[PDB]
Design an enzyme around this catalytic site. Sequence first.
Site, PDB file in Angstrom:
ATOM      1  N   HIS A  82       0.819  -1.219   0.000  1.00  0.00           N
ATOM      2  CA  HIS A  82       0.000   0.000   0.000  1.00  0.00           C
ATOM      3  C   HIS A  82       0.851   1.266   0.000  1.00  0.00           C
ATOM      4  O   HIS A  82       0.329   2.392   0.241  1.00  0.00           O
ATOM      5  CB  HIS A  82      -1.052   0.003   1.162  1.00  0.00           C
ATOM      6  CG  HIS A  82      -1.749  -1.274   1.124  1.00  0.00           C
ATOM      7  ND1 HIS A  82      -2.649  -1.611   0.103  1.00  0.00           N
ATOM      8  CD2 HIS A  82      -1.652  -2.388   1.922  1.00  0.00           C
ATOM      9  CE1 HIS A  82      -3.075  -2.830   0.263  1.00  0.00           C
ATOM     10  NE2 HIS A  82      -2.510  -3.422   1.488  1.00  0.00           N
TER      11      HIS A  82
ATOM     12  N   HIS B 206      -2.944   2.876 -25.256  1.00  0.00           N
ATOM     13  CA  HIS B 206      -2.931   1.568 -25.905  1.00  0.00           C
ATOM     14  C   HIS B 206      -3.637   0.490 -25.060  1.00  0.00           C
ATOM     15  O   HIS B 206      -3.861  -0.614 -25.567  1.00  0.00           O
ATOM     16  CB  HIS B 206      -1.498   1.162 -26.309  1.00  0.00           C
ATOM     17  CG  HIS B 206      -0.640   0.760 -25.160  1.00  0.00           C
ATOM     18  ND1 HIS B 206       0.297   1.621 -24.567  1.00  0.00           N
ATOM     19  CD2 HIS B 206      -0.478  -0.447 -24.514  1.00  0.00           C
ATOM     20  CE1 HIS B 206       0.993   0.939 -23.643  1.00  0.00           C
ATOM     21  NE2 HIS B 206       0.540  -0.330 -23.548  1.00  0.00           N
TER      22      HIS B 206
ATOM     23  N   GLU C 244      -7.741  -8.914   0.163  1.00  0.00           N
ATOM     24  CA  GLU C 244      -7.151  -7.580   0.311  1.00  0.00           C
ATOM     25  C   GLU C 244      -8.173  -6.677   0.993  1.00  0.00           C
ATOM     26  O   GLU C 244      -8.968  -5.945   0.367  1.00  0.00           O
ATOM     27  CB  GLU C 244      -6.764  -7.021  -1.068  1.00  0.00           C
ATOM     28  CG  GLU C 244      -5.609  -7.825  -1.705  1.00  0.00           C
ATOM     29  CD  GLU C 244      -4.279  -7.625  -1.008  1.00  0.00           C
ATOM     30  OE1 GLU C 244      -3.306  -8.369  -1.301  1.00  0.00           O
ATOM     31  OE2 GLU C 244      -4.205  -6.732  -0.058  1.00  0.00           O
TER      32      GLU C 244
ATOM     33  N   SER D  38       2.497  -1.785 -18.585  1.00  0.00           N
ATOM     34  CA  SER D  38       1.851  -0.683 -19.324  1.00  0.00           C
ATOM     35  C   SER D  38       0.841   0.075 -18.472  1.00  0.00           C
ATOM     36  O   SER D  38      -0.011  -0.581 -17.859  1.00  0.00           O
ATOM     37  CB  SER D  38       1.054  -1.272 -20.586  1.00  0.00           C
ATOM     38  OG  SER D  38       2.024  -1.377 -21.633  1.00  0.00           O
TER      39      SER D  38
ATOM     40  N   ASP E  93       0.536   8.840 -25.592  1.00  0.00           N
ATOM     41  CA  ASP E  93      -0.017   7.552 -25.142  1.00  0.00           C
ATOM     42  C   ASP E  93      -0.644   7.695 -23.754  1.00  0.00           C
ATOM     43  O   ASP E  93      -0.059   7.268 -22.738  1.00  0.00           O
ATOM     44  CB  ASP E  93       1.098   6.497 -25.177  1.00  0.00           C
ATOM     45  CG  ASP E  93       0.557   5.069 -24.964  1.00  0.00           C
ATOM     46  OD1 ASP E  93      -0.690   4.867 -24.921  1.00  0.00           O
ATOM     47  OD2 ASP E  93       1.391   4.139 -24.844  1.00  0.00           O
TER      48      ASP E  93
END
Lengths: 223, 165
Positions: free
Chosen positions: A10, A41, A61, A177, A86
């Site tokens: 965290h 993308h 969690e 990404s 992007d």
Amino acid sequence: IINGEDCSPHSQPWQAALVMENELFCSGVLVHPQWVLSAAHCFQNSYTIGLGLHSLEADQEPGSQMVEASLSVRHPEYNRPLLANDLMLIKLDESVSESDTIRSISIASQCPTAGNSCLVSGWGLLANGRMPTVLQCVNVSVVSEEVCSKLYDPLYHPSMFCAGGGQDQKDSCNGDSGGPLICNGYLQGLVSFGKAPCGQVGVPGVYTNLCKFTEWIEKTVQA
Amino acid sequence: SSVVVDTNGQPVSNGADAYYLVPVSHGHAGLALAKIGNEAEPRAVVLDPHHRPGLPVRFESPLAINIIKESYFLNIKFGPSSSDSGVWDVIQQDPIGLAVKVTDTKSLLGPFKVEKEGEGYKIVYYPERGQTGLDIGLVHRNDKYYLAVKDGEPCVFKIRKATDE
Ligand SMILES: [Cl-]
Ligand SMILES: [Cl-]
């Protein structure tokens, strides 16, 4: 993340997991209680977004939220030139209550400083080609625009910047990404693209240069 | 927004796994290398009726994602991730035309896309990574079926993960 370690749990509470049929395919970054920033993308027509995670198992969690989102707005210049601009903003269906494990981060207004060490985090591939069970963190350092354009022209554009390429082989990799690159306490970049394989000495990865887009982000969130 | 999927419905991976391009109406045949022109080594890609499922390929994008979308520009290559000796390109070669061939260098961003067509996918070649794509189909010459541009007459494939090896 190549040659990193488990994040302290965290410690990156802006990290968002974008999941498809229960598997992560990109990350994103909570930048407002109702908006996640990610790479363009990673666009999909709808999303399931995990917030407050460390492992990707929400049922293990406490404090996590799995939230739906339908609307996303890619930057209007995404992919012209190819790979550039992007970034996209995903509007969550509902604003989330922020906590100590789910928290937005401010975006750098200043552009990256060559040489500065920054932090990248994600659930993408490790050096061994396997996926980690918890969020990984690693430091990478910003490379000058001269080096980034030498390596990546004709595809280098100032909506990008480079980081990494050290002897240390620390890098982001596939599955990272859309995740954050934090410099000096602020969100500086998004993981975007690079030369494969990950972790090559002398070859930095490429990140979306978010200092170029602070006005478009603010206007999109306020519209 | 369209994710390319394999014959199990799973997203095709970005480079990490290999796959066979199985023609939807030629499952009896498979990709192979053959000679073209006067060349002494086989560098052209053909659909060979004696190999099934044929040589597996990997699809690669520089994006830091581990799935492939129909909008991404891709390299396609034979062989392991670690090798760039099997990378596809399209090369003018009479009398085939614009033939799919292998070479041992690779641009960061390849010139192919995998796009939905019919019951499966077609390979489309974009000269100069511009806006206009040319379908890859079959050209029959010298007793062989070369993969080559045949715009409007694509070879349609399904993509089978290569877990038999
Ligand atoms: Cl099958
Ligand atoms: Cl000749």
